[PDB]
Design an enzyme around this catalytic site. Structure first.
Site, PDB file in Angstrom:
ATOM      1  CB  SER A   1      -0.983  -0.010   1.122  1.00 56.17           C
ATOM      2  OG  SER A   1      -1.877   1.056   1.190  1.00 56.17           O
TER       3      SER A   1
ATOM      4  CG  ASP B   1      -6.755  -2.657  -3.387  1.00 61.88           C
ATOM      5  OD1 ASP B   1      -7.147  -1.701  -3.101  1.00 61.88           O
ATOM      6  OD2 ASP B   1      -5.434  -2.881  -3.162  1.00 61.88           O
TER       7      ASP B   1
ATOM      8  CG  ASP C   1      -9.729  -7.845   0.074  1.00 55.03           C
ATOM      9  OD1 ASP C   1      -8.576  -7.887   0.738  1.00 55.03           O
ATOM     10  OD2 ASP C   1     -10.827  -8.619   0.359  1.00 55.03           O
ATOM     11  CG  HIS C   2      -5.534  -2.496   0.333  1.00 59.46           C
ATOM     12  ND1 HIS C   2      -4.740  -1.996  -0.830  1.00 59.46           N
ATOM     13  CD2 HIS C   2      -5.247  -1.883   1.314  1.00 59.46           C
ATOM     14  CE1 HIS C   2      -4.046  -1.179  -0.234  1.00 59.46           C
ATOM     15  NE2 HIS C   2      -4.059  -1.246   1.133  1.00 59.46           N
TER      16      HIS C   2
END
Ligand SMILES: [Zn+2]
Length: 385
Positions: free
Chosen positions: A114, A315, A356-357
């Site tokens: 991130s 995401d 996803d994230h």
């Protein structure tokens, strides 16, 4: 081959090992850092401000690894209205950048998730060339980071990073909603409730938790502060399409660093499993409303990055298009990874689809595994000097 250690760098709202008991940012209920070390791949975990600027996080990162007291800089601090000096750390790897008896340099691999992807790009920019601004105007006792000439990083791997920013941060108000809900989500998921150990690390703004203040009041006081609208020195600016753009102008791909970027994409279901971070209001997965918001946000305004249909896939936290490498206001070369790592350029890896994230750092119904990260470390240790 290669024996440089790995330093792990969390992203937006990320937390350190002494926080959020029962859930590691890197691995969830598995301690990926320790397992990697047990496999023989030395890995360390760095901690930076979950919502500070990349500049601030980069300075915290230098101190956290090398050792010492955080120096945001004489010029930078004043211009933004800081405390110049931050916390003091023992150092994860004090011999970082030194030479061995045989005169080899002690480099590291930076693996980031991130916003950490932005942070470590910034770190190496400061390592290599320091800040001319700081070297000029500083009375005495300047931070070693700003000298320059330091080639201490061998590779950079970024995972689900917003190299062109996120439309999540462009919405301004939803940035704070996401932050609040992530803390609330962690407290529920671990069962910590109000006793959750979590710290925003904003002491250079005087926004540290007061005594006997509940987590909830502390959290609200932080994001209801005037600071967010008055400075451009926080995550909410740097995460935006507007701020990332700016960062891209002066944070460039270094020649002697291997770059790997992984991209994520997912449609988050509305049904909640016990295996993932919940949304405490909707009883959906945490990322469900944010994924839908990002997937429907478009913008065609003059002077700002134009946001069209190609920006909708995401995401849950970051647009997919933003993650293969910095493109906007950047000259960085981005390349499809063929099997041979090309130094000096971004080696864009095959798409991590339906990841996803939070999956990407090990938390969720489709989490990247310990074995996946072992695979990454192996690759990083096969890079030649
Ligand atoms: Zn700052």
């Amino acid at each position: 081959m290669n024996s440089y250690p790995i330093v792990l760098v969390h992203g937006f709202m990320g937390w350190g090992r002494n926080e959020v008991l029962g859930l590691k940012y890197w691995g969830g209920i598995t301690d990926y850092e320790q397992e990697l070390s047990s496999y023989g791949y030395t890995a360390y975990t760095a901690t930076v401000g979950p919502v500070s600027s990349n500049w601030d996080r980069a300075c915290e990162l230098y101190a956290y690894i090398k050792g010492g007291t955080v120096d945001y800089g004489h010029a930078h601090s004043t211009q933004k209205g800081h405390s110049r000096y931050g916390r003091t750390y023992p150092g994860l790897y004090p011999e970082w950048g030194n030479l061995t008896t045989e005169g080899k340099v002690n480099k590291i691999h930076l693996v980031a998730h991130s916003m950490g992807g932005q942070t470590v790009r910034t770190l190496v920019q400061l390592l290599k060339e320091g800040s001319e601004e700081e070297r000029n105007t500083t009375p005495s006792q300047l931070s070693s980071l700003f000298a320059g000439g330091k080639s201490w990083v061998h590779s950079i791997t970024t995972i689900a990073s917003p190299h062109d920013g996120t439309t999540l941060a462009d919405g301004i108000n939803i940035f704070g909603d996401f932050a609040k809900n992530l803390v609330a989500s962690l407290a529920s998921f671990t069962g910590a409730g109000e006793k959750l150990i979590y710290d925003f690390k904003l002491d250079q703004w005087g926004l540290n938790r007061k005594s006997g203040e509940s987590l909830t009041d502390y959290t609200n006081r932080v994001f209801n502060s005037a600071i967010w609208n008055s400075t451009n020195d926080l995550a909410n600016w740097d995460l935006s399409t507007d701020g990332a753009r700016v960062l891209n102008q002066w944070v460039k791909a270094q020649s002697d660093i291997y770059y790997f970027s992984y991209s994520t994409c997912a449609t988050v279901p509305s049904i909640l499993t016990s295996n993932e971070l919940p949304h405490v209001i909707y009883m959906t997965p945490l990322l469900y409303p944010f994924g839908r918001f990002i997937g429907s946000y478009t913008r065609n305004e003059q002077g700002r990055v134009i946001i069209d249909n190609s920006w909708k896939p995401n995401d849950g936290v970051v647009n997919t298009i933003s993650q293969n490498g910095p493109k906007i206001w950047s000259s960085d070369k981005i390349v499809n990874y063929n099997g041979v790592p090309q130094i000096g350029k971004w080696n864009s890896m095959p798409l991590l689809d339906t990841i996803d994230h939070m999956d990407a750092c090990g938390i969720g119904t489709n989490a990247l595994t310990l074995s996946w990260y072992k695979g990454l470390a192996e690759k990083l240790s096969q890079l030649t000097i």
